[PDB]
């Protein structure tokens, strides 16, 4: 068929079609979102204590808040 006619075109459309469709299958896009969201740039601001939250840990050593542990575990 066209595999002898314009073969570089066929390979181009093939890798293009997989580059379009292939993000629909991934266990890794959620990992990409977690990495690219959980990187701090600005200053992590403080806030007033007396909202009486069962969250927002007062100590940076304290793991009471949402953090990351899959990072060092790859």
């Amino acid at each position: 068929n066209v595999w002898a006619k314009e073969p570089v075109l066929v390979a181009s459309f093939a890798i293009a079609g997989l580059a379009v469709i292939l993000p629909t299958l991934s266990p890794y896009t959620k990992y990409s979102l977690m990495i690219n969201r959980a990187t701090p740039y600005n200053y992590p601001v403080p806030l007033r204590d007396d909202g009486n939250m069962p969250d927002v840990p007062s100590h940076p050593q304290d793991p009471q808040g949402p953090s990351l542990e899959w990072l060092k575990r790859l």
Binding site: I35, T39, P40, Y41, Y43, P44, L71, K72, L74
Partner: protein
């Protein structure tokens, strides 16, 4: 005697074939080993980039703790 330049009883033949070996790999084998080394490089690349991001996050935490 006579001393011309004759051939001595007949000489050996000399080839007239387009002697071509056409060696090297096929399409499938060369294609597959290229894509295999490509995927090897991809896996090692992925590993180094994510460990590098770990260290760069540590650098971010350094500038955070340094600032006030």
């Amino acid at each position: 005697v006579k001393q011309d330049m004759p051939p001595v009883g007949g000489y050996g033949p000399i080839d007239y074939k387009r002697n071509l070996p056409r060696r090297g790999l096929s399409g499938y084998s060369m294609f597959a080993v290229g894509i295999g080394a490509l995927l090897f490089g991809y896996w090692s690349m992925m590993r180094w980039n994510r460990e590098r991001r770990r260290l760069q996050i540590e650098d971010f935490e350094a500038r955070i703790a340094l600032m006030p």
